[PDB]
Amino acid sequence: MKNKAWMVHRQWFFDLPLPWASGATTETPTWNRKELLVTFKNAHAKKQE
Amino acid sequence: TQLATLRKLCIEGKITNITTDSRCPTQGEAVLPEEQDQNYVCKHTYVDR
Amino acid sequence: TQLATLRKLCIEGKITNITTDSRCPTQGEAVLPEEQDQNYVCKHTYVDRGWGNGCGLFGKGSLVTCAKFQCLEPIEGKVVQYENLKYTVIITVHTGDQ
Amino acid sequence: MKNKAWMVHRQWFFDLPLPWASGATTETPTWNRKELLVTFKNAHAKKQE
Amino acid sequence: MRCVGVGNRDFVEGLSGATWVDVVLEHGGCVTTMAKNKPTLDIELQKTEATQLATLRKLCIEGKITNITTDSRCPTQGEAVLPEEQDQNYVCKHTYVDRGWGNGCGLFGKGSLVTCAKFQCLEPIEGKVVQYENLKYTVIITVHTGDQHQVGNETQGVTAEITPQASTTEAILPEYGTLGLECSPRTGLDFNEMILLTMKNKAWMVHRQWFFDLPLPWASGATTETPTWNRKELLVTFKNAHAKKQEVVVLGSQEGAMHTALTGATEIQNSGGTSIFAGHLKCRLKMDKLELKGMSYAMCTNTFVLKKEVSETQHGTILIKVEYKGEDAPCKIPFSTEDGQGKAHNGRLITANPVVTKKEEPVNIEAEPPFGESNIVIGIGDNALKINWYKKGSSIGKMFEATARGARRMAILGDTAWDFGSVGGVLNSLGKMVHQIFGSAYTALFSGVSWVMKIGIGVLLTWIGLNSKNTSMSFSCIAIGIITLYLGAVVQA
Amino acid sequence: GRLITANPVVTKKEEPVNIEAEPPFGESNIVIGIGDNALKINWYKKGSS
Amino acid sequence: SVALAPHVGMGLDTRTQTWMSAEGAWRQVEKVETWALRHPGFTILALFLAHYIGTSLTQKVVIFILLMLVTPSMT
Amino acid sequence: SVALAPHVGMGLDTRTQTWMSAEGAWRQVEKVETWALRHPGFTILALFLAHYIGTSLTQKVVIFILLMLVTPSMT
Amino acid sequence: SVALAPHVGMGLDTRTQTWMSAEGAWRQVEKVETWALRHPGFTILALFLAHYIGTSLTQKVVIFILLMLVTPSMT
Amino acid sequence: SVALAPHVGMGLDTRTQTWMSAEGAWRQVEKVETWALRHPGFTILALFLAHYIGTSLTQKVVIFILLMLVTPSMT
Ligand SMILES: *[C@@H]1O[C@H](CO)[C@@H](O[C@@H]2O[C@H](CO)[C@@H](O[C@@H]3O[C@H](CO)[C@@H](O)[C@H](O)[C@@H]3O)[C@H](O)[C@H]2NC(C)=O)[C@H](O)[C@H]1NC(C)=O
Ligand SMILES: *[C@@H]1O[C@H](CO)[C@@H](O[C@@H]2O[C@H](CO)[C@@H](O[C@@H]3O[C@H](CO)[C@@H](O)[C@H](O)[C@@H]3O)[C@H](O)[C@H]2NC(C)=O)[C@H](O)[C@H]1NC(C)=O
Ligand SMILES: *[C@@H]1O[C@H](CO)[C@@H](O[C@@H]2O[C@H](CO)[C@@H](O)[C@H](O)[C@H]2NC(C)=O)[C@H](O)[C@H]1NC(C)=O
Ligand SMILES: *[C@@H]1O[C@H](CO)[C@@H](O[C@@H]2O[C@H](CO)[C@@H](O)[C@H](O)[C@H]2NC(C)=O)[C@H](O)[C@H]1NC(C)=O
């Protein structure tokens, strides 16, 4: 990531919770599990943002 | 050398377009046309009308 | 009269546009770019891959399939709200009449 | 359904194990729980359709 | 070579008297036959056709109703009969309806009522049977040739077709001698009680009695011009709104309820002539007429080089692909295994005779090292590159995996799995006999018990076994319970 | 087992003489002629003694 | 799969005759009986279970009959 | 009606995976669980029956669990 | 912060929703559970430690639950 | 989020130090310490629980230390 690199155990590299993609660099990645990053907040009843 | 890329993650977001829809009580869950695209994420919540 | 649909549910379905990708055994899961569509049904299963399947590392890799889904003859369950009932009652008198 | 109607309990109808839609008389529905109507035979372990 | 990493592939190192080894090759996966001073034969079952089927009885799923008729009687007149009731195409039912002066009957009360309906089912599913004298069992075998296009190939081998007409057949390998298959297709998976259940475009295999107890109207299957349906009443219902009158309604199609009605059934592809898969047959291998490629070749005297890396096969074996750049004649590939800090010879060549063919074919060697750290030297001379592979695991892990494989194999074939390696006979036969004696009664006892219910009854029997003051009762109940749980965890594969 | 027929003999070559025999219960092979090409017939009788 | 859990026992009805009254009413017990006729061995198994547990007679009957009613229905 | 008595338990199979393995395997217990969730009162009834009959504890458990398994399946 | 000490349980709550409740409800629990399913090796040691420490099933259970809960959350 | 569950003990041993050994060696204990300094109330509850559950000295001290570690971490 950025200008730095790392080595992480493979089993631990899928269980860290973030959106992930096929890694085909096709310029339009359809991200699996988009819900995890974006967060909905519902105020006291009423609208939703 | 000669690496292979798989599971590129995403560590930021930019929610550009937002849409909403409502339905009267006891009238089923309100669908939104922008639901079946491969780039939209959302959940259903309950509001008092 | 004047019923409200509420939710409908289908009985017969049709499947089109089969797609499939696979990974080498230790690469992890496999994802197709069309999985996020609500019209696609997906399932993950483990398949043994090898040099006969064009993968350098032998073992069991994940597999996934997709399918467009458009149900036919959907049955719909409507509800009747109270403000549209049409109860009627017919009464007769014991007239002397043939 | 088809040409015959029926009367059913609310919870029972909400627990029929078939994929449902919203019923918002939309142009195209967005089916919940599609997986339950279609099976995926896995002949041995070679491939599945 | 015909199969690597399939998951159920299992070696058989049998050298009996007169060199015949009995393997019961199931359809799911192959077997590999490593033998001393013989070419290691790899055998997998291929498509098992069975053509020219006989219809037997067919039964329908969707029905249609036409030509409604109805008569009624005054309450005390008795039953009512329509002149068309005796037709086998008409469905009839008697119900009591209240009649009166509003219905043009002088006497008030409840009179009988009857309805009729012509019946012609649509999309009838037909259940055919296969008699033994048309089976098309075929077996494709391959030899562990040094060849680059052999690592996991599925379209290279020698086809040995073995019908019950020709019970025993021999297949001639092109330059390795010949193999003698002494099979026994008649004792394979039962094919006189199973009934193919081809409907729409998908086929199925079902039990004889179960197919004779499907609650749908059937026909004879005599390929007549028009069928004569038995037990039509069960597909159509007769709503009786209050007590005024009744009409008839069909129950639509049934293909969904049918597809649900058979889950444990195995599926079979059916295109034209049926090509059913998933059957298993036992066979005897006459390996006494084999030769090992060329045993009169010289050993190589030049270098080797790895075109592609080595890799495991989840069975403790390696596939080393080697290209021989040395211009000299085709030569036997020298091989030795160097153990950790030792010159000892451990491990063996599954290929058993790796030889280069044309100096340009990267012929590949397949072997297994000891479970420690190993060194695989591949050539003669000091400049002979050493492939080093570290195979994770221990011998006891191999023992446990073998125990699991053996138990799982017994869970399917029953008594037939008792003989899968050498012929033996001194002690194998007695074990087979005793296990068959117990297992026929066992499988005749629990026939028809589900997943969770078999698990539950097993655990109930175990709990009974842990609460009795009798050695016999305790041991019998606990053994039966544990066996039942293990069988339930594998049943409905 | 037992050859239920007394001792079958081919009276004339042109048209077959048909044998009858009763094999044992177990799966047993049956040969006829002599040599490599001798016709051999497999059978599997169902049942026990 | 929908045929399991048929709409029955729910209280929503009247004296008007409902859908498939006689057929649906006797369907379940006919299926249980035919499954029992298919596999008589489980009768021996259930008799053994009833005999070796219960420590009474009415209890023996209850476990035997109800257990025999379970398996064809859980099938 | 044919969905009852599914083809299962009959011994005719091998290691090749059969029709609808996972779905069909878990279907029956899922249906039983959802029926139980629909009607919790029968849990009280079965507890009363188990408590007032059995004259033991393991027997109480056996009648309770098996009885609770019956009714959603006989439904 | 370092996102190791979430601002939770301060008591100054109101009817209105917090910043993130639907996820912070189960975040830490899911971390513990994914840890436990990933590594079962610690379970054997935790069972031993709870078992050989003075054993009354109350004490054994509380020690086992705490010891199995603390290591994941506080690595 | 991802900030939780570092692979501190992942076991891929190396000779050179890791990304942040200096901070990560003490960050968890720092969190516990600052949580305790912020909130002294939990100490009384932990002492009470240990005293009224701990039959012996060692059981009491183990219960106290586990309770005083789990809650600040689970916060
Ligand atoms: C799903 O599968 C179907 C076939 O099973 C695919 O239909 C095919 O779609 C392509 C592109 O839409 C069609 O090609 C078209 O041909 C015309 C001929 O002039 C050309 O001018 C267009 O530019 C286009 O390339 C193709 O005919 C069609 N095949 C059929 C209908 O049999 C479909 O694309 C798959 N995907 C989806 C989302 O439906
Ligand atoms: C079952 O019901 C159908 C209608 O639901 C009946 O079909 C009707 O049959 C009659 C006699 O076969 C047809 O009348 C014919 O009309 C031609 C017109 O020229 C006349 O020349 C013939 O002599 C004959 O009378 C009628 O058209 C036909 N209606 C249809 C087909 O809609 C049928 O008779 C009933 N019974 C059976 C056993 O099918
Ligand atoms: C979703 O949001 C995008 C964000 O830009 C919107 O696209 C704009 O649409 C308006 C309306 O016609 C145009 O005037 C702008 O020029 C558009 N901007 C861009 C960058 O395209 C629009 O609301 C949505 N876009 C979709 C649905 O494709
Ligand atoms: C399985 O073996 C066959 C036979 O060798 C392979 O088919 C050959 O493919 C090569 C490709 O370079 C051709 O040059 C040959 O002419 C083919 N031989 C034939 C068709 O008889 C096949 O490719 C092998 N399978 C795999 C997956 O490689």
Short mmCIF file of C-alpha atoms in Angstrom, two decimals, chain J:
data_model
loop_
_atom_site.label_atom_id
_atom_site.label_comp_id
_atom_site.label_asym_id
_atom_site.label_seq_id
_atom_site.Cartn_x
_atom_site.Cartn_y
_atom_site.Cartn_z
CA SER J 1 -12.93 -2.11 12.20
CA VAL J 2 -9.68 -3.50 10.84
CA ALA J 3 -7.78 -1.71 13.62
CA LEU J 4 -8.90 -4.54 15.89
CA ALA J 5 -7.34 -8.02 15.78
CA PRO J 6 -3.68 -7.40 14.90
CA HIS J 7 -1.71 -10.52 14.09
CA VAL J 8 0.65 -10.02 17.03
CA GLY J 9 0.90 -13.72 17.82
CA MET J 10 0.52 -14.95 14.25
CA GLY J 11 3.74 -16.90 14.75
CA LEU J 12 5.62 -16.10 11.53
CA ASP J 13 8.77 -15.65 13.57
CA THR J 14 11.58 -13.47 12.23
CA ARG J 15 14.91 -12.20 13.49
CA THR J 16 14.48 -8.50 12.70
CA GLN J 17 11.84 -6.57 14.58
CA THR J 18 8.36 -5.99 13.20
CA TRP J 19 6.54 -2.94 11.86
CA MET J 20 5.76 -1.37 15.25
CA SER J 21 7.29 -3.51 17.97
CA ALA J 22 7.96 -0.58 20.31
CA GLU J 23 4.39 0.70 20.55
CA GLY J 24 2.58 -2.60 20.04
CA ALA J 25 4.53 -4.19 22.88
CA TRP J 26 2.73 -1.96 25.38
CA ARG J 27 -0.31 -0.41 23.67
CA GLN J 28 -2.80 -2.93 25.06
CA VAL J 29 -1.52 -2.58 28.63
CA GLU J 30 -1.55 1.19 28.09
CA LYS J 31 -5.22 1.00 27.13
CA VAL J 32 -6.02 -1.04 30.23
CA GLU J 33 -4.04 1.34 32.44
CA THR J 34 -5.66 4.50 31.09
CA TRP J 35 -9.09 2.86 31.32
CA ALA J 36 -8.46 2.03 34.97
CA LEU J 37 -7.19 5.53 35.76
CA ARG J 38 -10.24 7.04 34.06
CA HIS J 39 -12.74 4.74 35.75
CA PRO J 40 -12.09 3.54 39.32
CA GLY J 41 -15.63 2.25 39.81
CA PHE J 42 -15.08 -1.20 38.34
CA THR J 43 -12.39 -2.03 40.91
CA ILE J 44 -14.90 -2.21 43.76
CA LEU J 45 -17.20 -4.47 41.75
CA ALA J 46 -14.34 -6.77 40.76
CA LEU J 47 -13.18 -7.01 44.37
CA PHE J 48 -16.72 -7.80 45.51
CA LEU J 49 -17.21 -10.50 42.87
CA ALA J 50 -13.86 -12.14 43.58
CA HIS J 51 -14.40 -12.03 47.35
CA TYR J 52 -17.85 -13.60 47.14
CA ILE J 53 -16.97 -16.24 44.51
CA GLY J 54 -13.34 -17.03 45.34
CA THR J 55 -13.23 -19.95 47.75
CA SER J 56 -9.44 -19.77 48.10
CA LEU J 57 -6.82 -17.06 47.77
CA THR J 58 -5.52 -18.07 44.35
CA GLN J 59 -9.00 -18.43 42.87
CA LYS J 60 -9.93 -14.99 44.19
CA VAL J 61 -6.83 -13.32 42.76
CA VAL J 62 -7.22 -15.02 39.37
CA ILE J 63 -10.87 -14.00 39.16
CA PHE J 64 -10.01 -10.43 40.12
CA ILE J 65 -7.22 -10.08 37.57
CA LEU J 66 -9.26 -11.63 34.76
CA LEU J 67 -12.25 -9.39 35.47
CA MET J 68 -10.04 -6.31 35.68
CA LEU J 69 -8.49 -7.20 32.31
CA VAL J 70 -11.53 -8.30 30.29
CA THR J 71 -13.84 -5.33 30.85
CA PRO J 72 -11.44 -2.51 29.84
CA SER J 73 -10.51 -4.53 26.76
CA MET J 74 -14.14 -5.36 25.94
CA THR J 75 -14.98 -1.65 26.17
#
